[PDB]
Nucleic acid binder design. Structure first.
Ligand SMILES: O=c1[nH]c(=O)n([C@H]2C[C@H](O)[C@@H](COP(=O)(O)OP(=O)(O)OP(=O)(O)O)O2)cc1F
Ligand SMILES: [Ca+2]
Length: 426
DNA sequence: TCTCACACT
DNA sequence: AGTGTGAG
């Protein structure tokens, strides 16, 4: 079993937030520019960077003042602030523009505000039968790269792409409606169409990866960016993985990937193939070891889940440094701010998508603790009312106040989080 | 520099 | 139910 059953794509909207601001403000298009939140602290934190700006070294998580040192003509759009906090509504609404188009072509799993996986297996099958048995023209794939091609016995990027595509298509056995390579190729044609539709109907450009599973689709998408798509076939996997750092594969970018590297003494994904499955399991657990054994051979079975809507709706703000909440009524006022945005977003959700959430998650962080969350508590969510929700959130966290004073809050709070969960049909 | 999904327990 | 990981 070679992990070639499915055709799966990952589509990534290139520097999406920037694109959203560039569509709305044409003065920004085709310039180095970035999206920031909170202008006051060091010019604001950069959450999205156009490709022109990235060429100067500007990255996400940079302060805008720092990015301006690297890129003096950098243009900035600020995120909308509402009730003292960054509000992402405009981007969420652009994201829904895009997913609704993608869903006309295939079933899509929303992976984040700017990317979606796409299961094209069924769509490919139908296109294959309408195609009589007729060859696939290079003209159907005007922005597609075939990973690992050209090879064997031109100095410009587009010349390379074409030569690789020619070599791919010249050897395609179109007379076999079950070759996985043919299916990928038809998958790629559909994604060219889907990306043409997204750009025509929204003005947004994006990159896509096309392969046999989600991890490879995602890896492929990042290989030829921006506004390009890449086909990673099963056959390309041994050479692709032979120099591919372990941390580049989805879910190995963190502690597990680090311990795979250290315990095993390897650097690249393909070095995993010399270990038995039992060996991998003993070091990393039954699930992880099984997952690694198959993955380093290009095989992964995680399904594209037919889910175009988030499972949770969440509202958080950080209060770092001297800005940590120290008084009771301060903590109340911000919970109320969080509860109010949440109500706004919950009501739109109940009306657009026919469902109500039923559980409220409250999470806080205390100054001096180490981790994203210090403590997580839940309670019932019965009415979309901001005042009750914030009253309830306070109720389930007021005992964390180690201060004996009634009006003070120690240790001061460095993060407040309200999340609606456990949706049911409405 | 605010999100969202999921595995373990 | 609560914590921790991984990612955008
Ligand atoms: O830390 C983050 N903060 C943060 O707001 N977002 C938001 C803002 C951003 O446009 C969007 C994109 O996430 P991506 O990691 O996929 O990167 P892009 O900007 O779209 O460009 P590309 O995929 O490299 O071409 O999510 C992602 C984060 F990772
Ligand atoms: Ca993106």
């Amino acid at each position: 079993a070679t992990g070639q059953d499915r055709v799966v794509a990952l589509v990534d909207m290139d520097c999406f937030f920037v694109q959203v601001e560039q569509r709305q403000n044409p003065h920004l298009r085709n310039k180095p520019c970035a999206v920031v939140q909170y202008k006051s602290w060091k010019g604001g934190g950069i959450i999205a960077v156009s490709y022109e700006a990235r060429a100067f070294g500007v990255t996400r998580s940079m302060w805008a003042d720092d990015a301006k040192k690297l890129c003096p003509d950098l243009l900035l759009a600020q995120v909308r602030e509402s009730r003292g906090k960054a509000n992402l509504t405009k981007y969420r609404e652009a994201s829904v523009e895009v997913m609704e188009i993608m869903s006309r072509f295939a079933v899509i799993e929303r992976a984040s505000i700017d990317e979606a996986y796409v299961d094209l297996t069924s769509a490919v099958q139908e296109r294959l039968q309408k195609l009589q048995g007729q060859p696939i023209s290079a003209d159907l794939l005007p922005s597609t790269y075939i990973e690992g091609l050209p090879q064997g016995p031109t100095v410009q990027k587009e010349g390379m792409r074409k030569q690789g595509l020619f070599q791919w298509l010249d050897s395609l056995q179109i007379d076999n409606l079950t070759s996985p390579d043919l299916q990928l190729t038809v998958g790629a044609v559909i994604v060219e169409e889907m990306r043409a539709a997204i750009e025509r109907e929204t003005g947004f450009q994006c990159s896509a990866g096309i392969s046999h599973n989600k991890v490879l689709a995602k890896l492929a998408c990042g290989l030829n960016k921006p506004n390009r798509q890449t086909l990673v076939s099963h056959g390309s996997v041994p050479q692709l993985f032979s120099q591919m750092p372990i941390r580049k594969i989805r879910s190995l970018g963190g502690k597990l990937g680090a311990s795979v590297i250290e315990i095993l003494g390897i650097e690249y994904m393909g070095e995993l193939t010399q270990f038995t499955e039992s060996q991998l399991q003993s070091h990393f657990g039954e699930k992880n070891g099984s997952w690694l054994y198959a993955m380093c051979r290009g095989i992964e079975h995680d399904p594209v889940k037919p889910r175009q809507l988030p499972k949770t709706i969440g509202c958080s703000k950080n209060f770092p440094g001297k800005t940590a909440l120290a008084t009771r009524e301060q903590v109340q006022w911000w919970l109320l701010q969080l509860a109010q945005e949440l109500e706004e977003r919950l009501t739109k959700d109940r009306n657009d998508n026919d469902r109500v959430a039923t559980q409220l998650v409250v999470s806080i962080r205390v100054q001096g603790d180490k981790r994203l969350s210090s403590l997580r508590r839940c309670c019932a969510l019965t009415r979309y009312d901001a005042h009750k929700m914030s009253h309830d959130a306070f109720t389930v966290i007021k005992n964390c106040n180690t201060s004996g004073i009634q009006t003070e809050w120690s240790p001061p709070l460095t993060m407040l989080f309200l999340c609606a969960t456990k949706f049911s049909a409405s």
